[model samples]
Target: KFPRVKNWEVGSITYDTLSAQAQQDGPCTPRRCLGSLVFPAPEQLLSQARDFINQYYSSIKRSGSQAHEQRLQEVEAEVAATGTYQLRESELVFGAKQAWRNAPRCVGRIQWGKLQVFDARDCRSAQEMFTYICNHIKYATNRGNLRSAITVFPQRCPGRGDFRIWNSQLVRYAGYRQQDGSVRGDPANVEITELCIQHGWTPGNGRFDVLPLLLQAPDEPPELFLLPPELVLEVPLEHPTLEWFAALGLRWYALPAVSNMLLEIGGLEFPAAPFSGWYMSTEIGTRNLCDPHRYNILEDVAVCMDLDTRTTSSLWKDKAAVEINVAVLHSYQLAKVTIVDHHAATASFMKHLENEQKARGGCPADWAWIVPPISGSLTPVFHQEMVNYFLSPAFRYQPDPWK
Candidate 1:
């Protein structure tokens, strides 16, 4: 008693329909999706600017003052004239801080207000972009004690392509593809490595090869710049008790400066903004070292530790993951680099959530990102209910430049 849909074929029409339905029902809903096609309206930008200005003035105990009203009028007038407006230096700095505070994926929002903002919107060439990024790395690295910072470049405009940095971070290891399809060094960077080679960069065949920056300006071809080795601070991995751990020859950079994300403030987009923060131990331990697609060192580490890797019930993977994390924490601490263990980081995030709730009615957090990969249930943030939604003045992930 079913209606006969004669056109539905198992391998063609039905399969195609199922695939489309799956995509539609996936996590990337149209409303939640962040793409070039989705942009905030001018009115939304104006409203967000008003809210940001009001909050900024109130923080300085000058809410509703003549200066505040005058500044708001200036923004409104500018938007009315050109359909978009620019943020003042002071406004830009405050908005940067608010954007960090609004980032749901970062658990280090406790230091949100302490970020140092650098305005480099006047840069017109890739060389200038490289110089600014080098300075940002040198300043933030500070030998060993890392500082949180961001360098904002030009904004996106109509009829022009967005300025972009192709690297995921200011510092990353290169991954070279072998003839047998296996990856050498960091597997996460194979595509980037191939692109750099195609662009006439000479790549070193080593475990820790620092990648060159690939920067693209609007309506222009991308250019490459080699980073000075001294500007990057790397820590050699070693454990306090496990002597064999150092033989693993693992190392990582002191700072994690993401360069590809877009910075949105009052609907205006800075597609070339680069930001950095001190790393949490688990990020380097469980993810970089143990992920199957990356190092896949879980079994190797268990073997080194003399554990029975024969059975999943033995929990050898868990044991090795903990020791690896311990080694990372120990190495960073010995080198006097700024790093936080998962336990302390989560505890601080909970405190931050409490403070934000008292100040702003609620806290936004993405549960999947905020929870540590290794041990979720043990952390304080694991038990707390979180709600995440889009807020103005936020950092968002954008499409890859090469793609």
Candidate 2:
């Protein structure tokens, strides 16, 4: 049965035919739905290879053609002999874009097709992996213009360890634990920062210190490489009208590269593919800065605004959050960096869903993830009831490499 969805503001509805294509069970059942929980596969090789080949061929309107059949035969024969198969560059490209399109949590899927896929499967050593990552950072950063890009490392194989990046994101700030049991940097990174320290990193005591990468080659211990500080572009947050806000000393990085997610294509899983896109302003302003577990600057900012921080009815947090978001947008723009506000991002994603609906009968979206963190009801996606389902190829979260 198709999932029925609705938009409260527009009084419109949509039936999600795409939900039927979900290949795995989600956190939903007949009795209850746990869609808000964060998720914390392989196949009969030949069959998965065939399905992916068909999708690739269909993407180019060449399904069932001789070339498509021949490609399938090649993969089957290769898998039959070696127990695995490799993807051609074109197929890899298709799989990468498909993975992005199938990512229900991403609000930036509207630009999925524009991704720059850097094939780093040939990398054999941690040093070479570092080179590829640096190149990706340089190209994707584009000196603050920011481009959507991914660099896929070697795939995980049986009887061998996987290539992995220990950090969740390619660019992250340090989180140092003080003697008093307080976090000095990004609190979300406390564990990772400790891992780096244990792995021979000299810690810094700055609020926005860029972390070094822990690149793990197959079956080998992780190697540490400090990211070139210049490559990481940061913007100092400053409110448009509030001059004192600049002295608060809050800042954030430009690139939003996710490093720890696994990229699955066909029947193959690449556990070390790092992909990135520009930031949606709220991601920085609200969650990263204001989330209680993260930087948690809401009270500080509210106090700076001289608002009634002592009470909730005054909505001081809300006012400060809005101003922070405005500052994020204004600061990024002032620095000539690329960014999208919640208003523009949600609108574009709505258009993407419409396009996907016409192209593939329906588009799958997690309603909880689709709405902006702040001003949930104000965004169009907030009103749109979305279907949650797993689709392939997909970017999936895996256990931390250390664990």
Candidate 3:
């Protein structure tokens, strides 16, 4: 049977015992005793001490905007897919059962390896595990390395960093059972669910294959935003509550603002559609961002093939290419819109907000869509617009894409 380790206490004990045993065993010969025990070279001892010192203070710092944003996007996507993400809280678990010589904090979420291998049968417990990561891991120097820690299982396998446990054979067999004689069906029929298939690891497929899967209904056209039942609850029926869509996988792309809000609310980030730049708004662009490879029209064409007649291509070839290109453009437009809208909406609402208005003095509003009043006379106008929407004849609630 494979071994099960609940914690790293065992490893710590073994290391301490080994050190003590070595000390107790006296040198067998005079020369051995002088060199190995009584007269160990000062430089050798100093070098070993230096190595230990470096390991003691060893920690990676989170740096670079691209790296931070990239990781943030990844975590957001993971949350979007599974509704939760786990972080490796235990130092022992994080270091692969190594002793905690320095009490190092993870400084980032658990490596992706631990997450993909997570047992899905008990998602509730898995969610709790995610919460632990979010709560315990503070932003620190080591958060950067956390991003690369997401490695494939069987760490030493031929293609390291090329697999995910969720899509691994272990997962395939997690709930599998032998077929009974009565069923008379393919034994392999006892397989993982579609949820796993959609998220499974494919050796040949690049990392793109493992991104969060956006739900697209074949019958319906792409939507800017669609609320799922799991997210919506009792809000004033007339105007929906501004529930964060990424958490529900409802937004076209996972807006960075939305992801930040989720993080504020103590949730894990996972793979979701990119919300920044040009990926958020346009319907076609949204789809392409979610499934970029599906739009590749030249996937099957041989590299050396000549541009023969346009008629020789598949009927949908041109259409597919156009759509994919448009999708990319639309995504960029959507992200731009989201940022602009968020700024405008937030500023507008805050201008006359009851809490804000109660503060006597005005706030500096330099939002692009609307300007705040510089004079006292303009305060009432600001109050009017805010009251009309937030407090007057039945508050008119609206979505803040930025928020």
Q: Quick one: ranking by lDDT, best first?
A: 2, 1, 3
lDDT of 2 by residue, 129-193 (tens): 99999999999999999999999999888898899999999999999887898899999999999
lDDT of 3 at 312: 46
- Tens-place lDDT digits, model 3, residues 178-227: 24532111122223222333344221222111122112122222112212
- Which parts of model 2 have CA positions greater than 4 angstroms off? 40-43
Q: Which residue segments of model 1 deviate by more than 4 Å?
A: 1-42
lDDT of each: 0.84, 0.90, 0.23
- Find the candidate with the highest lDDT and give its number: 2
The digit string of per-residue lDDT tens for model 1 on 308-341 reads: 9999999999999999999999999999999999
Residue 321 error for model 1, in Å?
A: 0.5
RMSD of every candidate to native, in Å, equals 10.1, 1.3, 26.0
Q: Rank the candidates by TM-score, best first.
A: 2, 1, 3
